[PDB]
């Protein structure tokens, strides 16, 4: 189902809420072998 403030959770919250929390996540998935 779709929420009322769901389309606002895309760019109506903060462009900083998906910078590293975005990438930081893959930090373990792809495990930076280095």
């Amino acid at each position: 189902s779709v929420s009322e403030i769901q389309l606002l959770h895309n760019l109506g919250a903060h462009l900083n809420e998906l910078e590293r929390v975005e990438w930081l996540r893959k930090k373990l998935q792809d495990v930076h072998n280095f």
Side-chain angles (χ1 to χ4, degrees), residues 1-7 9-17 19-34:
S1 141
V2 309
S3 224
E4 276 71 88
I5 56 108
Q6 202 251 339
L7 268 292
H9 117 100
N10 286 238
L11 17 146
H14 236 313
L15 183 142
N16 235 342
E17 200 189 150
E19 273 224 306
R20 309 130 162 111
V21 41
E22 135 152 306
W23 100 233
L24 242 44
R25 166 167 142 185
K26 290 142 148 288
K27 201 252 136 175
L28 226 294
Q29 256 262 311
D30 277 293
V31 50
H32 255 181
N33 195 81
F34 241 60

